mmCIF file of C-alpha atoms and ligand atoms in Angstrom:
data_model
loop_
_atom_site.group_PDB
_atom_site.id
_atom_site.type_symbol
_atom_site.label_atom_id
_atom_site.label_comp_id
_atom_site.label_asym_id
_atom_site.label_seq_id
_atom_site.Cartn_x
_atom_site.Cartn_y
_atom_site.Cartn_z
ATOM 1 C CA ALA A 123 0.000 0.000 0.000
ATOM 2 C CA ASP A 124 1.053 3.607 -0.575
ATOM 3 C CA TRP A 125 1.603 6.115 2.232
ATOM 4 C CA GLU A 126 -1.937 7.441 2.653
ATOM 5 C CA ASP A 127 -3.445 3.937 2.559
ATOM 6 C CA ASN A 128 -1.061 2.854 5.327
ATOM 7 C CA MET A 129 -1.976 5.927 7.381
ATOM 8 C CA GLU A 130 -5.657 5.118 6.818
ATOM 9 C CA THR A 131 -5.028 1.569 8.042
ATOM 10 C CA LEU A 132 -3.338 2.995 11.147
ATOM 11 C CA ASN A 133 -6.287 5.307 11.839
ATOM 12 C CA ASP A 134 -8.873 2.571 11.248
ATOM 13 C CA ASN A 135 -7.121 0.173 13.609
ATOM 14 C CA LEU A 136 -6.779 2.930 16.213
ATOM 15 C CA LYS A 137 -10.554 3.358 15.975
ATOM 16 C CA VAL A 138 -10.986 -0.418 16.290
ATOM 17 C CA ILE A 139 -8.817 -0.403 19.421
ATOM 18 C CA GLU A 140 -10.575 2.557 21.050
ATOM 19 C CA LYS A 141 -13.981 0.841 20.646
ATOM 20 C CA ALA A 142 -12.775 -2.707 21.315
ATOM 21 C CA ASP A 143 -14.983 -5.049 23.312
ATOM 22 C CA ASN A 144 -13.475 -8.053 21.474
ATOM 23 C CA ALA A 145 -10.723 -8.170 24.166
ATOM 24 C CA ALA A 146 -7.528 -9.799 22.759
ATOM 25 C CA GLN A 147 -8.512 -8.747 19.225
ATOM 26 C CA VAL A 148 -6.823 -5.454 20.163
ATOM 27 C CA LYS A 149 -3.566 -7.317 19.500
ATOM 28 C CA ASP A 150 -4.824 -8.147 16.006
ATOM 29 C CA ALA A 151 -5.486 -4.460 15.358
ATOM 30 C CA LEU A 152 -2.109 -3.603 16.875
ATOM 31 C CA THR A 153 -0.580 -6.283 14.657
ATOM 32 C CA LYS A 154 -2.108 -4.644 11.590
ATOM 33 C CA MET A 155 -0.834 -1.261 12.783
ATOM 34 C CA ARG A 156 2.693 -2.653 12.945
ATOM 35 C CA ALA A 157 2.324 -4.184 9.484
ATOM 36 C CA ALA A 158 1.129 -0.786 8.273
ATOM 37 C CA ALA A 159 3.972 1.252 9.769
ATOM 38 C CA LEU A 160 6.684 -1.070 8.455
ATOM 39 C CA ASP A 161 5.038 -1.084 5.029
ATOM 40 C CA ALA A 162 4.868 2.709 5.116
ATOM 41 C CA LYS A 163 8.650 2.768 5.571
ATOM 42 C CA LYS A 164 8.840 1.513 1.971
ATOM 43 C CA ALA A 165 6.450 4.190 0.673
ATOM 44 C CA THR A 166 7.072 7.811 -0.302
ATOM 45 C CA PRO A 167 4.828 10.800 0.425
ATOM 46 C CA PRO A 168 3.835 12.618 -2.779
ATOM 47 C CA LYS A 169 5.590 15.849 -1.771
ATOM 48 C CA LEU A 170 8.880 13.921 -1.408
ATOM 49 C CA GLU A 171 8.676 11.975 -4.683
ATOM 50 C CA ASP A 172 11.415 14.194 -6.161
ATOM 51 C CA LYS A 173 13.857 13.911 -3.242
ATOM 52 C CA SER A 174 16.489 11.198 -2.998
ATOM 53 C CA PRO A 175 15.355 7.994 -1.234
ATOM 54 C CA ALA A 176 18.135 8.525 1.343
ATOM 55 C CA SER A 177 17.752 12.309 1.606
ATOM 56 C CA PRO A 178 17.438 13.726 5.147
ATOM 57 C CA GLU A 179 13.690 14.232 4.636
ATOM 58 C CA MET A 180 13.103 10.574 3.721
ATOM 59 C CA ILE A 181 15.330 9.501 6.622
ATOM 60 C CA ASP A 182 13.158 11.588 8.951
ATOM 61 C CA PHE A 183 10.074 9.970 7.384
ATOM 62 C CA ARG A 184 11.257 6.403 7.990
ATOM 63 C CA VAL A 185 12.574 7.184 11.483
ATOM 64 C CA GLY A 186 9.231 8.725 12.429
ATOM 65 C CA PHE A 187 7.662 5.439 11.447
ATOM 66 C CA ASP A 188 10.271 3.772 13.688
ATOM 67 C CA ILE A 189 9.043 5.948 16.576
ATOM 68 C CA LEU A 190 5.501 4.853 15.738
ATOM 69 C CA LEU A 191 6.670 1.226 15.775
ATOM 70 C CA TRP A 192 8.164 1.558 19.253
ATOM 71 C CA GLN A 193 4.933 3.096 20.552
ATOM 72 C CA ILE A 194 3.011 0.229 18.925
ATOM 73 C CA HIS A 195 5.361 -2.159 20.742
ATOM 74 C CA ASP A 196 4.608 -0.433 24.044
ATOM 75 C CA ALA A 197 0.908 -1.026 23.373
ATOM 76 C CA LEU A 198 1.254 -4.593 22.074
ATOM 77 C CA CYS A 199 3.382 -5.837 24.977
ATOM 78 C CA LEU A 200 0.680 -4.648 27.384
ATOM 79 C CA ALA A 201 -2.011 -6.244 25.217
ATOM 80 C CA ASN A 202 -0.176 -9.589 25.189
ATOM 81 C CA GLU A 203 0.144 -9.752 28.986
ATOM 82 C CA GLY A 204 -3.640 -9.455 29.302
ATOM 83 C CA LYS A 205 -3.975 -5.691 29.926
ATOM 84 C CA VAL A 206 -6.488 -4.287 27.437
ATOM 85 C CA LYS A 207 -6.527 -0.990 29.316
ATOM 86 C CA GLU A 208 -3.355 1.127 29.364
ATOM 87 C CA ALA A 209 -2.780 -0.304 25.884
ATOM 88 C CA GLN A 210 -6.074 1.310 24.874
ATOM 89 C CA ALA A 211 -4.750 4.476 26.543
ATOM 90 C CA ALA A 212 -1.405 4.456 24.713
ATOM 91 C CA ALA A 213 -3.519 4.126 21.569
ATOM 92 C CA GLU A 214 -4.339 7.814 22.131
ATOM 93 C CA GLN A 215 -0.685 8.885 22.134
ATOM 94 C CA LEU A 216 -0.340 6.669 19.059
ATOM 95 C CA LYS A 217 -3.129 8.662 17.403
ATOM 96 C CA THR A 218 -1.397 11.906 18.392
ATOM 97 C CA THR A 219 1.914 10.831 16.852
ATOM 98 C CA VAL A 220 0.199 9.476 13.723
ATOM 99 C CA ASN A 221 -1.648 12.760 13.196
ATOM 100 C CA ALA A 222 1.589 14.686 13.768
ATOM 101 C CA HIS A 223 3.454 12.675 11.124
ATOM 102 C CA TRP A 224 0.495 12.958 8.734
ATOM 103 C CA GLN A 225 0.391 16.749 9.069
ATOM 104 C CA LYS A 226 4.182 16.819 8.722
ATOM 105 C CA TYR A 227 4.526 14.897 5.452
ATOM 106 C CA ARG A 228 1.217 15.548 3.658
ATOM 107 C CA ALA B 251 28.790 -11.203 8.725
ATOM 108 C CA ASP B 252 27.753 -12.557 5.330
ATOM 109 C CA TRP B 253 24.063 -12.318 4.457
ATOM 110 C CA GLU B 254 23.986 -16.031 3.633
ATOM 111 C CA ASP B 255 25.704 -16.816 6.946
ATOM 112 C CA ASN B 256 23.161 -14.635 8.746
ATOM 113 C CA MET B 257 20.358 -16.604 7.070
ATOM 114 C CA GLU B 258 22.098 -19.800 8.195
ATOM 115 C CA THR B 259 22.137 -18.450 11.756
ATOM 116 C CA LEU B 260 18.437 -17.572 11.549
ATOM 117 C CA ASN B 261 17.520 -21.062 10.314
ATOM 118 C CA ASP B 262 19.712 -22.802 12.901
ATOM 119 C CA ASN B 263 18.215 -20.836 15.784
ATOM 120 C CA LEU B 264 14.719 -21.485 14.421
ATOM 121 C CA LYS B 265 15.535 -25.197 14.596
ATOM 122 C CA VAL B 266 16.788 -24.614 18.149
ATOM 123 C CA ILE B 267 13.520 -22.896 19.119
ATOM 124 C CA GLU B 268 11.475 -25.727 17.597
ATOM 125 C CA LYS B 269 13.122 -28.232 19.978
ATOM 126 C CA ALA B 270 13.593 -25.904 22.961
ATOM 127 C CA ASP B 271 12.713 -27.172 26.438
ATOM 128 C CA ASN B 272 12.374 -23.988 28.527
ATOM 129 C CA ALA B 273 12.065 -20.223 28.164
ATOM 130 C CA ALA B 274 15.789 -19.506 28.585
ATOM 131 C CA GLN B 275 16.725 -21.468 25.457
ATOM 132 C CA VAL B 276 13.980 -19.726 23.468
ATOM 133 C CA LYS B 277 15.194 -16.319 24.660
ATOM 134 C CA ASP B 278 18.817 -17.152 23.820
ATOM 135 C CA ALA B 279 17.960 -18.360 20.315
ATOM 136 C CA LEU B 280 15.753 -15.315 19.708
ATOM 137 C CA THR B 281 18.557 -13.002 20.848
ATOM 138 C CA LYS B 282 20.939 -14.707 18.421
ATOM 139 C CA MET B 283 18.320 -14.331 15.672
ATOM 140 C CA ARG B 284 17.933 -10.627 16.463
ATOM 141 C CA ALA B 285 21.703 -10.155 16.286
ATOM 142 C CA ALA B 286 21.849 -12.002 12.955
ATOM 143 C CA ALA B 287 19.002 -9.907 11.524
ATOM 144 C CA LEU B 288 20.521 -6.611 12.685
ATOM 145 C CA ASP B 289 23.801 -7.693 11.090
ATOM 146 C CA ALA B 290 22.123 -8.746 7.834
ATOM 147 C CA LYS B 291 20.486 -5.308 7.657
ATOM 148 C CA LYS B 292 23.978 -4.001 6.811
ATOM 149 C CA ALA B 293 24.581 -6.664 4.145
ATOM 150 C CA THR B 294 23.743 -6.755 0.437
ATOM 151 C CA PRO B 295 21.894 -9.874 -0.786
ATOM 152 C CA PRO B 296 23.041 -11.593 -3.998
ATOM 153 C CA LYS B 297 19.963 -10.484 -5.950
ATOM 154 C CA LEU B 298 20.606 -6.817 -5.081
ATOM 155 C CA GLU B 299 24.354 -6.660 -5.756
ATOM 156 C CA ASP B 300 23.535 -4.611 -8.886
ATOM 157 C CA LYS B 301 21.639 -1.963 -6.882
ATOM 158 C CA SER B 302 22.940 1.066 -5.022
ATOM 159 C CA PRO B 303 22.948 0.864 -1.199
ATOM 160 C CA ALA B 304 20.277 3.597 -1.020
ATOM 161 C CA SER B 305 18.155 2.365 -3.933
ATOM 162 C CA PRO B 306 14.474 1.616 -3.219
ATOM 163 C CA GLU B 307 15.205 -2.117 -3.509
ATOM 164 C CA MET B 308 17.836 -2.008 -0.753
ATOM 165 C CA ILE B 309 15.581 0.143 1.439
ATOM 166 C CA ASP B 310 12.809 -2.438 1.019
ATOM 167 C CA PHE B 311 15.326 -5.181 1.874
ATOM 168 C CA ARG B 312 16.269 -3.428 5.117
ATOM 169 C CA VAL B 313 12.584 -2.863 5.910
ATOM 170 C CA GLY B 314 11.947 -6.582 5.415
ATOM 171 C CA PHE B 315 14.631 -7.300 7.978
ATOM 172 C CA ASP B 316 12.930 -4.747 10.250
ATOM 173 C CA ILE B 317 9.727 -6.784 9.866
ATOM 174 C CA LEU B 318 11.684 -9.891 10.836
ATOM 175 C CA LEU B 319 13.102 -8.044 13.857
ATOM 176 C CA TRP B 320 9.639 -7.075 15.078
ATOM 177 C CA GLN B 321 8.374 -10.644 14.683
ATOM 178 C CA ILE B 322 11.431 -11.786 16.659
ATOM 179 C CA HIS B 323 10.496 -9.259 19.336
ATOM 180 C CA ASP B 324 6.944 -10.619 19.453
ATOM 181 C CA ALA B 325 8.341 -14.102 20.057
ATOM 182 C CA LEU B 326 10.728 -12.724 22.695
ATOM 183 C CA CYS B 327 7.910 -10.930 24.526
ATOM 184 C CA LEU B 328 5.982 -14.203 24.527
ATOM 185 C CA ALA B 329 9.048 -15.992 25.914
ATOM 186 C CA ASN B 330 9.584 -13.415 28.676
ATOM 187 C CA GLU B 331 6.070 -14.144 29.978
ATOM 188 C CA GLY B 332 6.814 -17.873 30.280
ATOM 189 C CA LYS B 333 4.646 -18.799 27.269
ATOM 190 C CA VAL B 334 7.083 -21.166 25.582
ATOM 191 C CA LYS B 335 4.564 -22.860 23.281
ATOM 192 C CA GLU B 336 3.207 -19.503 22.102
ATOM 193 C CA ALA B 337 6.806 -18.453 21.443
ATOM 194 C CA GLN B 338 7.369 -21.546 19.291
ATOM 195 C CA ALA B 339 4.098 -20.917 17.447
ATOM 196 C CA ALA B 340 5.415 -17.425 16.680
ATOM 197 C CA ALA B 341 8.741 -18.936 15.610
ATOM 198 C CA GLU B 342 6.716 -20.803 12.980
ATOM 199 C CA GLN B 343 5.736 -17.456 11.427
ATOM 200 C CA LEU B 344 9.383 -16.451 11.861
ATOM 201 C CA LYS B 345 10.396 -19.456 9.750
ATOM 202 C CA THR B 346 7.848 -18.567 7.069
ATOM 203 C CA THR B 347 9.208 -15.010 6.870
ATOM 204 C CA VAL B 348 12.826 -16.216 6.817
ATOM 205 C CA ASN B 349 12.123 -18.663 3.985
ATOM 206 C CA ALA B 350 10.306 -15.942 2.035
ATOM 207 C CA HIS B 351 13.267 -13.576 2.433
ATOM 208 C CA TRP B 352 15.692 -16.333 1.411
ATOM 209 C CA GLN B 353 13.710 -17.159 -1.728
ATOM 210 C CA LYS B 354 13.293 -13.462 -2.541
ATOM 211 C CA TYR B 355 16.874 -12.238 -2.152
ATOM 212 C CA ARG B 356 19.129 -15.232 -2.894
ATOM 213 C CA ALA C 4 24.849 19.748 17.105
ATOM 214 C CA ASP C 5 21.607 17.875 17.740
ATOM 215 C CA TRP C 6 23.266 14.451 17.460
ATOM 216 C CA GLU C 7 25.757 15.592 20.108
ATOM 217 C CA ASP C 8 22.881 16.787 22.300
ATOM 218 C CA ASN C 9 21.210 13.387 21.922
ATOM 219 C CA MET C 10 24.447 11.640 22.913
ATOM 220 C CA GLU C 11 24.694 13.884 25.978
ATOM 221 C CA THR C 12 21.072 13.068 26.852
ATOM 222 C CA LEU C 13 21.852 9.350 26.559
ATOM 223 C CA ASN C 14 24.861 9.736 28.857
ATOM 224 C CA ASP C 15 22.899 11.777 31.417
ATOM 225 C CA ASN C 16 20.083 9.232 31.553
ATOM 226 C CA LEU C 17 22.639 6.421 31.853
ATOM 227 C CA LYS C 18 24.070 8.178 34.909
ATOM 228 C CA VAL C 19 20.517 8.581 36.239
ATOM 229 C CA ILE C 20 19.910 4.838 35.821
ATOM 230 C CA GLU C 21 23.203 3.993 37.525
ATOM 231 C CA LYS C 22 22.153 6.202 40.471
ATOM 232 C CA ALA C 23 18.532 4.971 40.603
ATOM 233 C CA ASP C 24 16.596 3.126 43.311
ATOM 234 C CA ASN C 25 13.126 2.072 42.076
ATOM 235 C CA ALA C 26 11.914 0.810 38.692
ATOM 236 C CA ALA C 27 9.951 3.941 37.775
ATOM 237 C CA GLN C 28 13.089 6.096 37.646
ATOM 238 C CA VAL C 29 14.869 3.531 35.459
ATOM 239 C CA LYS C 30 11.822 3.280 33.188
ATOM 240 C CA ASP C 31 11.599 7.061 32.778
ATOM 241 C CA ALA C 32 15.316 7.377 32.036
ATOM 242 C CA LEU C 33 15.119 4.513 29.520
ATOM 243 C CA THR C 34 12.139 6.138 27.790
ATOM 244 C CA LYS C 35 14.127 9.370 27.504
ATOM 245 C CA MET C 36 17.035 7.314 26.139
ATOM 246 C CA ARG C 37 14.796 5.714 23.508
ATOM 247 C CA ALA C 38 13.505 9.139 22.464
ATOM 248 C CA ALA C 39 17.047 10.524 22.198
ATOM 249 C CA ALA C 40 18.304 7.504 20.240
ATOM 250 C CA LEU C 41 15.418 7.710 17.768
ATOM 251 C CA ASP C 42 15.980 11.453 17.348
ATOM 252 C CA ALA C 43 19.699 10.910 16.715
ATOM 253 C CA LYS C 44 19.118 8.051 14.254
ATOM 254 C CA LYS C 45 17.795 10.556 11.690
ATOM 255 C CA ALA C 46 20.696 12.982 12.211
ATOM 256 C CA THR C 47 24.087 13.180 10.522
ATOM 257 C CA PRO C 48 27.086 12.739 12.849
ATOM 258 C CA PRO C 49 29.965 15.223 12.512
ATOM 259 C CA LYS C 50 32.408 12.606 11.201
ATOM 260 C CA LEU C 51 30.080 11.750 8.290
ATOM 261 C CA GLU C 52 29.182 15.321 7.290
ATOM 262 C CA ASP C 53 31.437 15.136 4.219
ATOM 263 C CA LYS C 54 29.750 11.894 3.090
ATOM 264 C CA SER C 55 26.779 11.585 0.773
ATOM 265 C CA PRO C 56 23.450 10.733 2.452
ATOM 266 C CA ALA C 57 23.331 7.631 0.215
ATOM 267 C CA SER C 58 26.673 6.377 1.540
ATOM 268 C CA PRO C 59 26.881 2.985 3.292
ATOM 269 C CA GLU C 60 28.428 4.757 6.295
ATOM 270 C CA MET C 61 25.087 6.424 7.077
ATOM 271 C CA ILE C 62 23.258 3.105 6.665
ATOM 272 C CA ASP C 63 25.617 1.401 9.115
ATOM 273 C CA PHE C 64 25.186 4.402 11.438
ATOM 274 C CA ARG C 65 21.401 3.985 11.470
ATOM 275 C CA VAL C 66 21.697 0.204 11.912
ATOM 276 C CA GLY C 67 23.982 0.726 14.902
ATOM 277 C CA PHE C 68 21.276 2.959 16.323
ATOM 278 C CA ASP C 69 18.809 0.106 15.783
ATOM 279 C CA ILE C 70 21.118 -2.168 17.797
ATOM 280 C CA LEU C 71 21.268 0.450 20.553
ATOM 281 C CA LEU C 72 17.467 0.731 20.533
ATOM 282 C CA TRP C 73 17.042 -3.016 20.966
ATOM 283 C CA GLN C 74 19.500 -3.012 23.876
ATOM 284 C CA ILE C 75 17.480 -0.153 25.394
ATOM 285 C CA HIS C 76 14.370 -2.299 24.916
ATOM 286 C CA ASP C 77 15.986 -5.209 26.757
ATOM 287 C CA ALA C 78 16.868 -2.902 29.651
ATOM 288 C CA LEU C 79 13.323 -1.504 29.686
ATOM 289 C CA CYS C 80 11.835 -5.013 29.738
ATOM 290 C CA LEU C 81 14.081 -5.843 32.694
ATOM 291 C CA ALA C 82 12.870 -2.676 34.432
ATOM 292 C CA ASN C 83 9.175 -3.321 33.709
ATOM 293 C CA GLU C 84 9.245 -6.672 35.544
ATOM 294 C CA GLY C 85 10.621 -5.117 38.735
ATOM 295 C CA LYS C 86 14.260 -6.095 38.093
ATOM 296 C CA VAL C 87 16.303 -3.022 39.047
ATOM 297 C CA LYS C 88 19.837 -4.403 39.443
ATOM 298 C CA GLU C 89 19.584 -6.445 36.237
ATOM 299 C CA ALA C 90 18.339 -3.340 34.427
ATOM 300 C CA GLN C 91 21.334 -1.435 35.815
ATOM 301 C CA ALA C 92 23.730 -4.080 34.471
ATOM 302 C CA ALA C 93 21.984 -3.885 31.091
ATOM 303 C CA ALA C 94 22.369 -0.105 31.346
ATOM 304 C CA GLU C 95 26.109 -0.527 31.901
ATOM 305 C CA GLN C 96 26.194 -2.520 28.661
ATOM 306 C CA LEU C 97 24.163 0.328 27.137
ATOM 307 C CA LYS C 98 26.811 2.758 28.401
ATOM 308 C CA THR C 99 29.492 0.722 26.633
ATOM 309 C CA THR C 100 27.531 0.764 23.362
ATOM 310 C CA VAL C 101 26.642 4.466 23.622
ATOM 311 C CA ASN C 102 30.229 5.538 24.295
ATOM 312 C CA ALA C 103 31.406 3.316 21.435
ATOM 313 C CA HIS C 104 28.999 4.966 18.987
ATOM 314 C CA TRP C 105 29.705 8.456 20.354
ATOM 315 C CA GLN C 106 33.490 8.269 20.078
ATOM 316 C CA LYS C 107 33.151 6.492 16.728
ATOM 317 C CA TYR C 108 30.982 9.118 15.023
ATOM 318 C CA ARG C 109 32.029 12.335 16.803
HETATM 319 BI BI1 BS3 D 670 8.199 -7.371 26.902
HETATM 320 NI NI1 NI D 671 8.814 -5.462 24.290
#
């Protein structure tokens, strides 16, 4: 998927997590989020299609997705132990960071 | 070291995880796998020896090894909680991903 | 510049961990360390300023930061399970790695 489709997947799974009664299915959503972020590291925002793939802007892009991945890890480790809460709370900081990166590179 | 030797290490430690008896052996093998994957991130696979180190193909290669690293971390988080059988079930997905990378980049 | 500031932040939080008592202090210092390491991964160290962004030196630099991040994660996992002294030993290993990277790329 391209960049905006991956960001849409992230937002949709954040919504699934925030309204999750399915219990451990949060992990599934989190899983998808991870698979999105990693995939988005291979994409390029349209405004950076002219830059070099290793230019400082693209490096910042991929490293921001690394930050997202570490936050997703913080949520998923709590979800795996059996703590749906706190993971659902860190989903909000995840949404904040996702919106920040979206506004940054769109 | 060599990308092929790193793949050998990944396969050997997957075999170790498949026959592991406790959580310590699973954790040790997963740590060795993580080291091998981090080292292979700096390598160039045989299929991509005609591509620049910052080409999109090499970036996608490194992102694939990032995916492998996060799956390794999932297995390691399962092993830290004492869930050895869940860790081996995750090592199955690890083996699928490793075989896919081997077939893709050899 | 900012990479140097991130290295100094890493060193300060390593000192904080070495002089810590409970797990919350170690966790907070390790979270600050993760933030600083991620922020420095997308920077250019002074030794590599004369190199192209597409050079393999920068790729190895970022991969070394990935290694440092995973060591930070191991320390944070030790701290999250109420293991303070083990987290401090892991943080001494982190100090070794951080000083290695700092004196290598400064
Ligand atoms: Bi954990
Ligand atoms: Ni973890």
